[PDB]
């Protein structure tokens, strides 16, 4: 920057700029069946899971 005690710079023109800002609002909602994942629909399993 050129700096002086008696010097200033003043804009004689302007520019209009449009910019995009992206913010995540939500994430996928998920539900898990505990017996289906661990027992895999086994009758013998889930007796232990009680």
């Amino acid at each position: 920057v050129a700096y002086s005690n008696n010097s200033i710079a003043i804009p004689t023109n302007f520019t209009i700029s449009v910019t995009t800002e992206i913010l995540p609002v939500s994430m996928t909602k998920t539900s898990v069946d505990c017996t289906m994942y661990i027992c895999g629909d086994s009758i013998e399993c889930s007796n232990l899971l009680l």
Binding site: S31, D33, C34, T35, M36
Partner: protein
């Protein structure tokens, strides 16, 4: 699922508590001859351990 007698207002996803399979099927290849247990166990002579 809630382990409580009283239930409030909610969507309340629920774990399955119903029976589906009532039929049992066995599929095995066609084998008619019995295993030769008599040759394997009831043998006049047996090999030396070495």
């Amino acid at each position: 699922t809630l382990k409580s007698l009283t239930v409030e207002k909610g969507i309340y996803q629920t774990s399955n508590f119903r029976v589906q399979p009532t039929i049992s099927i066995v599929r095995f290849p066609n084998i008619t001859n019995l295993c030769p247990f008599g040759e394997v166990f009831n043998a006049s002579k047996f090999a030396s351990v070495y």
